[PDB]
Subunit: 230 residues, 6 copies
Amino acid sequence: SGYSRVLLKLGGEMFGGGQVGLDPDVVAQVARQIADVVRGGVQIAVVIGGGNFFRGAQLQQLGMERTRSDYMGMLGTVMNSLALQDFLEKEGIVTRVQTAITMGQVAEPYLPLRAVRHLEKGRVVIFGAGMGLPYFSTDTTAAQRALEIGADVVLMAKAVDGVFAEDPRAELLTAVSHREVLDRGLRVADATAFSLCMDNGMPILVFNLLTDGNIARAVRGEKIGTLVTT
Amino acid sequence: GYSRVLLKLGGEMFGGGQVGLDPDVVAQVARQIADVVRGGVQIAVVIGGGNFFRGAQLQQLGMERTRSDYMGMLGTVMNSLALQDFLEKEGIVTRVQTAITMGQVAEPYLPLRAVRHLEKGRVVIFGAGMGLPYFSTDTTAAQRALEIGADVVLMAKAVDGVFAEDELLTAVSHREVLDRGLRVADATAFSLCMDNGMPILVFNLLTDGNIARAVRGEKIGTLVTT
Amino acid sequence: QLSGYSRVLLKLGGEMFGGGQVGLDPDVVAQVARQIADVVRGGVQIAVVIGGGNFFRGAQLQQLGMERTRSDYMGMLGTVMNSLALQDFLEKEGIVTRVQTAITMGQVAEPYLPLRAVRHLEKGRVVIFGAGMGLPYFSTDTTAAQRALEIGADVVLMAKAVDGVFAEDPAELLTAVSHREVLDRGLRVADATAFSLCMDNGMPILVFNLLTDGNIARAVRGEKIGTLVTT
Amino acid sequence: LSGYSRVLLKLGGEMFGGGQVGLDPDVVAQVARQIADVVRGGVQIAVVIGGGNFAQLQQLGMERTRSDYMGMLGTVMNSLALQDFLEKEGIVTRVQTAITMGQVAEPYLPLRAVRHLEKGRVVIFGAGMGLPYFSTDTTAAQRALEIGADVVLMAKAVDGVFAEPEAELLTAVSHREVLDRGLRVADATAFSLCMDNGMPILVFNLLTDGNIARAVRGEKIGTLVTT
Amino acid sequence: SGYSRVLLKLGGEMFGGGQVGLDPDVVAQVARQIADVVRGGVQIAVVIGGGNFFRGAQLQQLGMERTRSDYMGMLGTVMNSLALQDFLEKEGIVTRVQTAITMGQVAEPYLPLRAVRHLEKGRVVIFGAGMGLPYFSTDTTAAQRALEIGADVVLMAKAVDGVLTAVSHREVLDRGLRADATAFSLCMDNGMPILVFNLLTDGNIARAVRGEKIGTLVTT
Amino acid sequence: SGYSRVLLKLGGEMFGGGQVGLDPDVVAQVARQIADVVRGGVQIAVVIGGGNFQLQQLGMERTRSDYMGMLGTVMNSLALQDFLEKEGIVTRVQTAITMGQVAEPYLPLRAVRHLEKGRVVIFGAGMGLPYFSTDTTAAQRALEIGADVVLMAKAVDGVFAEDPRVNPEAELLTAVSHREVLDRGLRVADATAFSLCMDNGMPILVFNLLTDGNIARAVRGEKIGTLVTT
Ligand SMILES: Nc1nc2c(ncn2[C@@H]2O[C@H](COP(=O)(O)OP(=O)(O)OP(=O)(O)O)[C@@H](O)[C@H]2O)c(=O)[nH]1
Ligand SMILES: Nc1nc2c(ncn2[C@@H]2O[C@H](COP(=O)(O)OP(=O)(O)OP(=O)(O)O)[C@@H](O)[C@H]2O)c(=O)[nH]1
Ligand SMILES: Nc1nc2c(ncn2[C@@H]2O[C@H](COP(=O)(O)OP(=O)(O)OP(=O)(O)O)[C@@H](O)[C@H]2O)c(=O)[nH]1
Ligand SMILES: Nc1nc2c(ncn2[C@@H]2O[C@H](COP(=O)(O)OP(=O)(O)OP(=O)(O)O)[C@@H](O)[C@H]2O)c(=O)[nH]1
Ligand SMILES: Nc1nc2c(ncn2[C@@H]2O[C@H](COP(=O)(O)OP(=O)(O)OP(=O)(O)O)[C@@H](O)[C@H]2O)c(=O)[nH]1
Ligand SMILES: Nc1nc2c(ncn2[C@@H]2O[C@H](COP(=O)(O)OP(=O)(O)OP(=O)(O)O)[C@@H](O)[C@H]2O)c(=O)[nH]1
Ligand SMILES: O=c1ccn([C@@H]2O[C@H](COP(=O)(O)OP(=O)(O)O)[C@@H](O)[C@H]2O)c(=O)[nH]1
């Protein structure tokens, strides 16, 4: 008894897989995994970060205002999205990109009602350029997009396949509540992103995506990673 | 003293409420923002839109949350346009920037523009929230305050401050508000402020001179710093 | 060739929305949604223009000291409040409804694209034209006229608080008059500018009381109630 | 002499080609020179042109709506032509269009339009009001009101409005009177707009050079409809 | 052979006669020709010039900025586009008008991905307002749009039958044969074919789209 | 006989130095060179390429690849803007693709206005059209603003008289005509961009920005690089 639609959050750093820019192998793994989800019947939107595109940084510890570096990140996210679109399309998966800041020529504008329409036709929707606002993390973009599209859950792709009870200098939980996560003293996401989720009862699912087969199992409701709930 | 502030108000303040828009309150409020400005302070303002909803009928009655949100955002703009007029009448040059671009109605959201407006000695009213549902006016206020590099978020309430808990407190840390166990603002709004170290001063605007009291550094309503 | 009107611009006043008072009384809105729904189900095409008196004219605020242009936009914003409310209710009636705003408000609704509004109509969806025409110094009645024109409406339906146009300010109720006859028998106020626009393009106007349940349906049916203004 | 701080001049598009299709460079230079007379006299001036110089199309099929958009685009071409000729006469001019058209011209923004007028620039408003079924007359009205104009100058081809042998030209008439039988100074919509707002209209003969400058000083020119 | 999809470039200077303005007997006759091409199952995009609304080059001679001229031309091309659209719709051909300068409800934004979608639905697409940029000819707009919609050939409508029946891109450079230089380079660098043919002689469009030996082909 | 306003073209590759992304040494160096020119009273607009962020040789469709590049050029612009500003120079970025908060709309008349106030204008996002080089974007914008010259930064300080693959021991030019460039196979810019310039009498000056003082020499009218004039 799993999920009908989900929002998947990838960090920008993932796409470069250390180092800077795009490792087209990594992005291939991800497209392939996202396809398994589509074919499994489930509807998926993706929110990607933009970290892979500066050293770094470097830019900030080095002069740049947060405001400007956030806009650079947003532009990064949109490069990430177009690359992913392309790998998904060669995978047979029809994909659309909507950008928070409207970039007429490059992609579609952010219109959640049209996005839902896309999902309902078995298209992946990718959400680029965050929320178009400095001071919000990708996590927070993820939470809010999951809400707008009415996602059943926000799938958080980490490198750790769950959430450890206490730092291991230890077993990772399978399922904890929102209050438990906050109430001494864990860290699933950025606090702001977590607040949005908590105040709206959005389930978060922390898991490793690059472990082949994870996401298709996750979306079947198959107890992988750590499910935050209430 | 505070050099530049974000003043936040719930839409219901503009109701003197009562529902809708009371002009003597808008007048009163523009009169006092006018004093703060003539004093040399820079002021960005953020108003909610709650005063145009009868309590919460249609939200209850079955409106999509997203559609309520947008109705509220339209509310904010109606309040913004109103305040603009009463300030201009008060002699003070006022711009309205909307998160939702509404061509002729107001300027678009341009943070660098807004700062340049402020340093030219104008008021900037930020309207339509952030154009994004599932976010409150307090969150709009926080983000806007961070963008424009404001010293504090002033939260004009119809209460003297923050208590514990209906014993009005006077100074607390951000950390201290979480651990037990207060409500200064929206959960999501508070986090944004805290994750960035942004001060928040909660005071009663209903007693005259309180905004002036607040900005010039007088103590106080409840200040929250970390 | 079918009977009554095929597509129709329904002009609804904002005060009637309303109460009563400032803002929105959902019972009124819900009642109006249901009547519109019945008419739509039978395959009449309806586009709606809503007023803003429950929030602001005008016009009004100009007198009060406020800047006219600013005040007009507040009124137009008020009409988008109403437009979203009516949308929510029509939906709950099982009627697909689209709001097009004259002032693009990206996230909030669709832009004003009239050829697309007509496509909506052809698919059996109601379209609510909000934000007026987006042009200060104009009223919603003129919006109603203009929009009727763009979408090739058969008639403007003026749903007022009284049952038609009377000969002289109050009887009698005139069932049928000319656009010209209105200025000849000086039968203000249906809004001169809005009226002139309909007169210059031979756009029929039916003025009728919406407060009597079932009256919209009668209007649409080519049934003789209120006042039909032609030309 | 009374006279006007700020005015809106309305021109029919057909005049610009007069009377061949497209643009007559003499006529446009003649119009520019009169407008420069107005800015020389220290009066602020906004202009609204029609687009008829570029509806037999309706005759053989075309939707009125689509024909109207065609005209709207014509008005912008006319606006651009007049701007150019004004710039030659040393007059700084901006064009704002009702429908935003990006790099071709400024968006329509009344408060910025008056900021230009205050700086002594000419503003030209194009693309009607961006909506079919409205006349150029009506656009002129609506724009005049938005920019807080003192009058709408209707450039016309006759000296004004008569009671006609030879008889008297009407120097000054009330709105109520024009209406109360039975003259057209603008179309009913345009005229209605002005009357509900107390907006004067001055119908005059642009063809005689010196006239608009005489009008704006407050000299007795043409037919003033007050108000 | 055939062409599955083709971009047809029309000089504005033919929608008038010219004389100056719009000649409906010429626009209607062009709609007619395009309608056959559509009915016969080909997908076609149109790029139109704006020169029929100018009086010689009177304005440019009198000191008009190119910038401002080119902008006048663009608005010209939108005028022609809407005329053609109208005449095509009267022929039962569903037609959409995309403008490089976005123009609200006058016509659609330039969005080549939906252009291709309109095409796939049988619709005709007319591109107006050039590329929304001065210093670029109609030929260049023709080339680029041809490239963006993945067209098979640029059909260059002319008053002369061709240039000669078939050549390469380099041969044209070598010999010195005459489209606009900058336009031609865009096509050469992407191997885009160009068919210069005489739109005037009737039925000549329906010939080209069936791969028939007509005019001049600049396939490399 | 110096120049009053100039359009400086900068290759993306430049900014990488010569790895992926942004080297804040290379950009600081470029910023100062430009700051020397502005302080001098000369007016300068800048057009930046996007290479620093091969993939089309991986299936990526041309159109989409071009947009990747354009997005890169906006990143570069914002980076240069940050360095110019900290060099004391007020600078505005205009993007061919409209990006709300990120930069300005492309609006040349407004750009000229910025140049007259002694501000630098950086033109980002190419011309928002696929199938068009950076050189072409520079040629077009140069003409839009009424530039005197396109300044064309290359690490080789000139144009060879013959292709070095035909004559290994060529040999730099100092001055040539546009025709002289055309007949032959001289190598100034790509074909499309050179046509724009030649047909409009736009001079192009090829020179090496990275040796200090070189741009200052160029704008003053000193004999520097290769100058193509008709
Ligand atoms: N609705 C709307 N109004 C605008 C916009 N941009 C400028 N304005 C208005 O234009 C008017 C004049 O201001 P600007 O032209 O921007 O010039 P400024 O930066 O304010 O400086 P000044 O020249 O002293 O006026 C003001 O009333 C602004 O509100 C806009 O994008 N939308
Ligand atoms: N993203 C974006 N930023 C803008 C836009 N317009 C102005 N800005 C920014 O706003 C800030 C202040 O500029 P303005 O108040 O608009 O006036 P300005 O033209 O930049 O400066 P002056 O002409 O001297 O008054 C600048 O730092 C600009 O970067 C815009 O349309 N988009
Ligand atoms: N807020 C807003 N919503 C829009 C806008 N454009 C489309 N939508 C919404 O997107 C949803 C999906 O429909 P669309 O993608 O517009 O196309 P459609 O023709 O209405 O739907 P189909 O019948 O599938 O063709 C509808 O609810 C529209 O109202 C817009 O510009 N703003
Ligand atoms: N195409 C187009 N041009 C614009 C737009 N906004 C401004 N411009 C042009 O830019 C040039 C310079 O004007 P601005 O930078 O806006 O400032 P300004 O109005 O000249 O104000 P001051 O120079 O301080 O008097 C003028 O030629 C304007 O017409 C626009 O939105 N579109
Ligand atoms: N001017 C302008 N017209 C538009 C725009 N979008 C759509 N239209 C018009 O609206 C009508 C198309 O309706 P759509 O529903 O969007 O067309 P579609 O993609 O085939 O889907 P359906 O018509 O719903 O079956 C046509 O007349 C279009 O020309 C726009 O952005 N600008
Ligand atoms: N760049 C860009 N592409 C767009 C935009 N809107 C639609 N498209 C593209 O146009 C192509 C066809 O889209 P549409 O014409 O809207 O059709 P659709 O919405 O996908 O849905 P159907 O045609 O009903 O199946 C897609 O590849 C879209 O990405 C836009 O705003 N910007
Ligand atoms: O095109 C329009 C449409 C309406 N409005 C404003 O919106 C207000 C409310 O509309 P209206 O007066 O028609 O409301 P109603 O009388 O129908 O309740 C008007 O008073 C105007 O101020 C406007 O300025 N232009």
